[PDB]
C-alpha cells in the first residue's frame with residue numbers, strides 16, 4: 001500500500017490512516033448492518 | 034473488606050495493599066443464578082441426587098476433598114471468569130453490588146497501595162488448571178476455554194455488540210488457524226477488561242473521596258523467573 005509523500009525529501013511510506021480507515025471500514029460498517 | 038461498612042471502634046485494619054486486583058472487577062461478585070447453576074453443575078459431575086438445596090449440600094459435604102477438587106477443576110477448565118467461585122451478595126456480610134457500595138463514602142482513614150503487572154494475564158492465572166487438564170489429557174480442551182473467555186468478554190450477559198466492539202478494537206479476528214496472535218490478543222483483552230481498568234477505576238474512586246492516601250504502581254513485564 002505504498003504512497004508518495006509530497007514533502008521536501010519526497011519519501012515513501014506504507015500506511016495511510018490505517019487505524020482510522022480500519023475504524024471507518026471494518027468496524028463501523030458492521031455496526032451499520 | 035474495604036467495601037464492607039463496620040463500626041469505627043472495631044475497624045479490623047488501617048491500610049490496604051492490593052497487588053493486582055480490585056472489587057470493581059466484573060467477576061468479583063457472582064449473582065445468585067450463576068452460583069446456583071455452578072452448584073447444580075458440580076452436583077451433576079459428582080452425581081449427587083439433585084432434589085433440593087439441603088439435599089445437594091448434604092450430599093456434597095460427605096465427598097472426599099480430592100474428588101471435589103478434581104471435579105471443580107474439570108468444570109472450571111472450560112468455564113469463563115463469570116463462572117468462577119467467588120463471593121456472593123449474602124445480604125449480611127455484603128449488601129449491594131460493589132460499584133454501588135463504593136459510593137457510600139463512609140470509610141474512616143483507609144489508605145491504599147494498589148498496582149498491577151504487565152504479565153498478569155487471566156490465561157496466565159490458569160496455568161495449573163491447564164497442567165492438570167493436560168495431565169488427564171482431556172483432548173487439550175483449550176478452544177472451549179477460549180470461546181467461553183471470548184463470550185465472557187461481552188459483559189455479564191453475553192451481548193453481540195460489545196462482542197463485536199471487543200473483537201474490533203483488539204485484533205482478535207477469529208482466526209484460530211494461528212493460535213499465537215489470537216491467544217495473545219485474547220489475553221490482552223481479558224487483562225485490560227478484568228484486571229487493569231478496574232484497578233484504575235478503583236484507585237480513581239478511592240482518591241476522589243479524599244479520606245485516605247492512594248498510591249498506584251505498575252510493574253512492566255519481566256522476562257525470566
Ligand SMILES: *[C@@H]1O[C@H](CO)[C@@H](O[C@@H]2O[C@H](CO)[C@@H](O[C@@H]3O[C@H](CO[C@H]4O[C@H](CO)[C@@H](O)[C@H](O)[C@@H]4O)[C@@H](O)[C@H](O[C@H]4O[C@H](CO)[C@@H](O)[C@H](O[C@H]5O[C@H](CO)[C@@H](O)[C@H](O)[C@@H]5O)[C@@H]4O)[C@@H]3O)[C@H](O)[C@H]2NC(C)=O)[C@H](O)[C@H]1NC(C)=O
Pocket residue numbers: 013014015016017018151204214215217218221
Ligand atoms: C497486546 O498488548 C501488547 C502490550 O503489552 C502489545 O505490544 C505492543 O503493541 C504496540 C502497538 O502499538 C507496539 O507499539 C508500537 O511500537 C513501535 C516501536 O517501534 C518499533 O518496535 C516494533 C516492535 O515492538 C516494530 O514492529 C516497529 O515496526 C518498530 O520497529 C512504534 O513504532 C509503533 O508506532 C505506531 O504508531 C505510531 C503513532 O503515531 C506511528 O507513527 C507508527 O508509524 C508506522 O506506521 C505508519 C502507518 O501508521 C507509517 O506511516 C510509518 O512509516 C511507521 O512505519 C506506528 O503506526 C507502535 O507505537 C509495541 O511495540 C508493542 N510491544 C511492546 C513491548 O509494547 C501487543 O501488540 C498487543 N497485541 C497482541 C496481539 O499481542
